[PDB]
Amino acid sequence: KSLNVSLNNRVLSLTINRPELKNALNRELYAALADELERSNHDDQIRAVLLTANGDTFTAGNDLDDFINPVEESGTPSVIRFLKAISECETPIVVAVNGPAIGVGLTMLLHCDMVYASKSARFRAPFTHVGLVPEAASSLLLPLAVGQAWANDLMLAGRILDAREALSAGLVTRVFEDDVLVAESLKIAEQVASLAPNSVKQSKRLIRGVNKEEVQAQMKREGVIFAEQLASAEFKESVAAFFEKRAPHFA
Amino acid sequence: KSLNVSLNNRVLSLTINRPELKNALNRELYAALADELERSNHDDQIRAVLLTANGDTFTAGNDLDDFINPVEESGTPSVIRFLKAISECETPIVVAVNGPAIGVGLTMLLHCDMVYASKSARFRAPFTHVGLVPEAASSLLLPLAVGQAWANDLMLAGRILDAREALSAGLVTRVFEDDVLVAESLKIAEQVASLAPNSVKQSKRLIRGVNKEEVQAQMKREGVIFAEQLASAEFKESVAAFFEKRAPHFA
Amino acid sequence: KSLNVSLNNRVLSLTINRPELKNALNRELYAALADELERSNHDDQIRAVLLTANGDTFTAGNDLDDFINPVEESGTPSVIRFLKAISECETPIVVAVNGPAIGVGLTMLLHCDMVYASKSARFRAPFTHVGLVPEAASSLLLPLAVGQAWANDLMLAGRILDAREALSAGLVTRVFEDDVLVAESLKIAEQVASLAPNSVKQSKRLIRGVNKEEVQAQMKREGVIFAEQLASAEFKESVAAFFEKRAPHFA
Ligand code: NA
Numbered sequence: 001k002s003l004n005v006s007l008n009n010r011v012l013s014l015t016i017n018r019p020e021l022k023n024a025l026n027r028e029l030y031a032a033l034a035d036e037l038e039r040s041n042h043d044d045q046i047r048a049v050l051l052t053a054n055g056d057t058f059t060a061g062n063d064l065d066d067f068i069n070p071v072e073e074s075g076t077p078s079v080i081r082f083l084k085a086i087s088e089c090e091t092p093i094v095v096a097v098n099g100p101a102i103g104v105g106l107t108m109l110l111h112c113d114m115v116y117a118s119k120s121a122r123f124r125a126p127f128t129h130v131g132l133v134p135e136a137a138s139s140l141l142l143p144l145a146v147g148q149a150w151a152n153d154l155m156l157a158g159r160i161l162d163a164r165e166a167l168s169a170g171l172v173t174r175v176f177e178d179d180v181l182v183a184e185s186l187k188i189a190e191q192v193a194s195l196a197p198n199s200v201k202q203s204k205r206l207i208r209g210v211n212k213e214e215v216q217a218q219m220k221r222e223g224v225i226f227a228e229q230l231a232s233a234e235f236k237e238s239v240a241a242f243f244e245k246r247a248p249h250f251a
Numbered sequence: 252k253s254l255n256v257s258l259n260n261r262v263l264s265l266t267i268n269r270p271e272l273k274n275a276l277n278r279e280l281y282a283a284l285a286d287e288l289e290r291s292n293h294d295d296q297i298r299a300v301l302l303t304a305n306g307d308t309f310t311a312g313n314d315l316d317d318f319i320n321p322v323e324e325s326g327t328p329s330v331i332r333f334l335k336a337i338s339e340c341e342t343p344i345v346v347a348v349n350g351p352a353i354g355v356g357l358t359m360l361l362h363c364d365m366v367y368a369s370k371s372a373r374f375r376a377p378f379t380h381v382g383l384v385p386e387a388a389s390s391l392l393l394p395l396a397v398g399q400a401w402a403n404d405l406m407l408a409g410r411i412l413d414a415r416e417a418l419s420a421g422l423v424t425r426v427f428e429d430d431v432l433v434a435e436s437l438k439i440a441e442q443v444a445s446l447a448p449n450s451v452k453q454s455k456r457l458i459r460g461v462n463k464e465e466v467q468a469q470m471k472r473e474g475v476i477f478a479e480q481l482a483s484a485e486f487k488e489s490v491a492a493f494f495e496k497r498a499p500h501f502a
Numbered sequence: 503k504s505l506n507v508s509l510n511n512r513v514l515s516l517t518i519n520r521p522e523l524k525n526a527l528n529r530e531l532y533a534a535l536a537d538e539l540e541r542s543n544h545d546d547q548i549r550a551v552l553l554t555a556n557g558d559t560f561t562a563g564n565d566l567d568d569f570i571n572p573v574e575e576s577g578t579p580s581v582i583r584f585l586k587a588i589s590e591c592e593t594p595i596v597v598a599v600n601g602p603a604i605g606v607g608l609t610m611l612l613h614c615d616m617v618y619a620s621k622s623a624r625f626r627a628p629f630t631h632v633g634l635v636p637e638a639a640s641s642l643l644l645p646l647a648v649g650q651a652w653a654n655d656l657m658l659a660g661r662i663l664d665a666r667e668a669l670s671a672g673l674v675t676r677v678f679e680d681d682v683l684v685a686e687s688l689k690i691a692e693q694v695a696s697l698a699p700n701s702v703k704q705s706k707r708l709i710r711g712v713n714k715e716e717v718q719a720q721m722k723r724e725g726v727i728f729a730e731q732l733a734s735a736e737f738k739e740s741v742a743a744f745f746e747k748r749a750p751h752f753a
Pocket residue numbers: 040041042043044045046047091
């Protein structure tokens with residue numbers, strides 16, 4: 001399976017598992033993440049989510065082939081279900097970033113609660129290098145999380161951060177040796193899952209309630225511009241340039 | 252007295268003084284803090300407040316006995332007067348955190364202006380460990396102050412920060428050796444008190460004016476949920492578990 | 503000229519050049535900066551701005567003589583044109599802070615995108631030491647950028663930050679040796695200027711769109727109070743005190 005799932009000690013562990021494609025997110029994986037996060041809200045015996053990935057990468061971003069598949073989905077697109085499920089999840093989420101977190105690998109962290117990283121973790125949101133724009137309301141949430149200057153160094157200039165730089169900016173709050181990241185993140189998730197459940201749920205609701213409506217509105221504003229860029233010559237050329245091993249040209 | 256007060260060089264020095272109970276806040280102390288902060292607004296010759304505490308602790312949080320006293324107060328509860336007085340204080344406040352600042356010891360700092368700490372200072376807002384929720388509008392202000400990731404590591408996971416971690420997160424901006432914290436904080440308070448008074452008052456008004464209304468609204472939203480949790484089985488059990496030296500159980 | 507301008511590789515390089523007065527901003531310089539930033543919006547072949555200054559200072563703030571010139575300007579004051587042009591600039595701006603950035607030298611950075619500094623850079627916004635109030639919407643933007651505690655240590659207490667402290671607070675995101683700051687900042691500006699132009703422009707629009715309207719409203723609120731302080735006894739006395747080599751007295 002592309003998403004490994006286990007449930008113990010009232011923690012739902014979700015492990016992204018396509019190490020062959022550097023844990024690139026496709027339709028199937030988005031659908032499965034959405035399914036599990038929705039499950040967490042409705043089961044009162046699920047009190048924390050631990051999210052991580054197998055191997056040396058957290059995720060390399062959107063799967064390219066699956067990104068540009070002409071065959072449109074039945075019903076709501078899986079990426080949209082995922083963004084809605086993670087942005088509205090009532091359950092506290094601990095995320096353990098085990099390696100490079102690129103694009104949607106970075107932006108999904110803004111909707112997690114406890115954000116921890118290994119020393120080998122890296123972070124990038126290079127929307128401009130591919131000719132696209134911020135998604136998952138990161139145009140609102142990234143500056144709130146790290147300030148305007150870090151947010152622009154990431155989103156406009158395409159900077160890659162290491163784990164220590166992410167910590168100093170406040171994007172992550174703990175950095176562990178690679179070999180203990182998961183065990184230490186699980187210990188924290190288990191502790192949260194053992195606390196008074198309504199206390200935790202209400203506390204998160206109060207915290208997330210401040211920007212809840214603007215988060216949904218910003219995803220729609222970004223989405224319109226994103227769709228337009230995805231279908232434009234600028235996207236084609238950014239992508240073609242990389243595969244043709246040349247500098248992109250924009251007249 | 253539980254609050255030592257002096258006035259010199261146009262600085263009102265407020266020193267919390269219940270070292271026997273680790274400077275735990277009770278009704279009397281809240282009332283006295285409220286009285287002094289209100290005085291600061293109305294006296295034009297009081298131009299800065301220096302807030303600190305005696306001994307090795309800044310404050311251990313709410314006094315438990317006084318917290319759950321069935322005998323209700325006459326008029327407005329002292330904690331409410333305090334939160335209103337500190338959130339609306341027009342006078343600049345320098346706070347020198349001399350040791351552990353727990354619960355309301357942490358959240359009151361979000362309503363101070365200059366936030367300084369000793370090397371022995373520690374910071375915690377473990378609302379979830381006691382089965383409660385954020386107060387004093389910290390569900391809004393804590394993420395603004397340190398970002399979403401630090402704010403959740405504090406409020407949901409119950410993390411304890413040392414002084415250097417608080418500095419790196421931006422919760423405090425200076426860390427001093429214990430034996431000079433107070434003298435160095437007073438020097439800064441005296442300098443501010445010697446500046447053009449309307450310049451300082453208006454500058455603070457502009458800064459605080461951005462979230463002024465949302466701060467009051469958020470305290471009311473938090474307050475309803477807080478009262479409900481305080482009277483619930485989850486609070487009883489969280490507290491009983493600690494005193495009975497056992498793991499809490501929430502079905 | 504007081505502003506050196508060059509255009510190469512689709513980067514408009516703007517270098518503030520009054521090293522004789524420590525790069526103090528006067529009417530002429532504001533007008534020239536406004537002219538160039540407006541040019542950047544309307545020329546599709548200008549895709550990044552690099553802003554820096556000659557010598558050992560970025561800017562010492564407002565030119566005092568020019569500040570209090572009784573002869574009023576024809577049309578819109580140059581400072582207002584500049585603040586409007588930089589706050590609404592559609593072009594990404596890389597700013598390389600080569601030395602002390604004082605007052606408007608600090609606040610203009612909140613409207614730049616990529617904020618980089620030399621090791622000799624220093625930062626100060628001492629509005630209260632001169633009897634004035636925050637400008638250029640820094641009463642809103644500074645706390646968003648660095649948190650409430652850093653913002654107050656700057657604006658109320660008049661703290662001077664070095665480059666490493668600015669980095670740790672997130673006001674700047676890179677610190678370079680003095681002798682490479684400009685070359686490294688230009689390399690980044692050139693890279694941004696080579697990316698898909700609508701991708702970059704829209705990305706910045708989404709990021710800046712969140713606070714765009716409040717930034718303009720806050721400049722007007724600050725402006726009214728500022729004008730009042732500038733014409734008051736408090737300003738006269740703050741300034742006179744410095745020149746008369748004495749402590750200011752405010753009854
Ligand atoms: Na649940």
